[PDB]
């Protein structure tokens, strides 16, 4: 596949994992360029272009959702994060804190304090990145409403509490490594199918569900794929919520 939206390689350095946004040893970053490509492909499959509610129900460290929240602030009404275990969620919460000017100010201050203490140039590189992100966030809509809760995405009855009355237009998630057959591989068909059915039970009919994995092709049949892409070692697939429901059990 070719980049349709992220056509020219951007300066995504301010959003790099471990600069302003928070890194973890146990969770991967996600490439910014691919994140924005997938998100823009999903937006292109929505009926209209009003403000979008975006949900990541396997949010991990929250890096992915936070990249999208900042980068695509102008296109977003709110973001929702959820995942099954407490460990990732502590870090996801730190990342989501960056979706307000106050959170970015706090991170910038932390980096400036680290500069004074340690003297490493990178801390000041990070403080300036946080300042720039805050300035863009302020100009592009201000604080982005966000919520984060624990929930098992495979349990459809858990979902209404995560949504708290919101109707997500886009789900975008990087599949958790524990759902893979093994660490090297990919999530198999039955788990993917169950994930999609669970989500579609909670979403409005028009919602676009976009999932990505380390694989050549993510199995969704008998659901019809709206669209697929392959970039590097990663693939993505998008489906419509209404179509998932039409496929049956």
UniProtKB/Swiss-Prot annotation:
GO biological process: methylation; response to antibiotic; rRNA methylation
Gene3D superfamilies listed in its UniProt record: Helix hairpin bin, Vaccinia Virus protein VP39
Disulfide-linked positions: none
Class in the EC hierarchy, top level: transferase
The entry's keywords: Antibiotic resistance, Methyltransferase, S-adenosyl-L-methionine, Transferase
Keyword Methyltransferase: yes
One GO molecular-function entry: rRNA (guanine-N1-)-methyltransferase activity
InterPro entries: AviRa, SAM-dependent_MTases_sf
Catalyzed reactions: guanosine(2535) in 23S rRNA + S-adenosyl-L-methionine = N(1)-methylguanosine(2535) in 23S rRNA + S-adenosyl-L-homocysteine + H(+)
EC number(s) reported in the record: 2.1.1.209
Keyword Nucleus applies: no
Physiological role: Specifically methylates the guanine-2535 in 23S ribosomal RNA. Confers resistance to antibiotic avilamycin, an orthosomycin antibiotic.
Name listed for the protein in its UniProt record: 23S rRNA (guanine(2535)-N(1))-methyltransferase
């Amino acid at each position: 596949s070719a980049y349709r939206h992220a056509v020219e390689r951007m300066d995504s350095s301010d959003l790099a994992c471990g600069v302003v946004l928070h890194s973890a040893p146990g969770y991967p970053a996600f490439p910014v360029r691919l994140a924005t490509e997938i998100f823009q492909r999903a937006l292109a499959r929505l009926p209209g272009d009003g403000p979008v509610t975006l949900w990541d129900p396997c949010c991990g460290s929250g890096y992915l959702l936070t990249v999208l929240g900042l980068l695509h602030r102008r296109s977003l009404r709110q973001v929702i994060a959820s995942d099954v275990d407490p460990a990732p969620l502590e870090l996801a919460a730190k990342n989501l804190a960056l979706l307000s000017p106050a959170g970015l100010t706090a991170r910038e201050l932390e980096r400036r304090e680290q500069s004074e203490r340690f003297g490493k140039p990178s801390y000041l590189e990070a403080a300036q990145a946080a300042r720039r992100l805050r300035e863009r966030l302020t100009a592009e809509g201000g604080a982005l409403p966000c919520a984060i809760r624990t929930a098992d995405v495979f349990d459809p009855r858990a979902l209404s509490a995560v949504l708290a009355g919101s109707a997500p237009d886009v789900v975008l998630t990087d599949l958790p490594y524990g759902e893979r057959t093994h660490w090297e591989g990919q999530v198999p068909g039955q788990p993917v199918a169950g994930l999609l059915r669970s989500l579609a039970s909670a979403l409005p009919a028009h919602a676009v569900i976009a999932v990505t994995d380390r694989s050549r092709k993510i199995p969704v049949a008998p659901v019809k794929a709206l669209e697929r892409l392959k970039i590097g070692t990663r693939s993505a697939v998008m489906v419509r919520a209404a179509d998932v429901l039409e496929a049956g059990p």
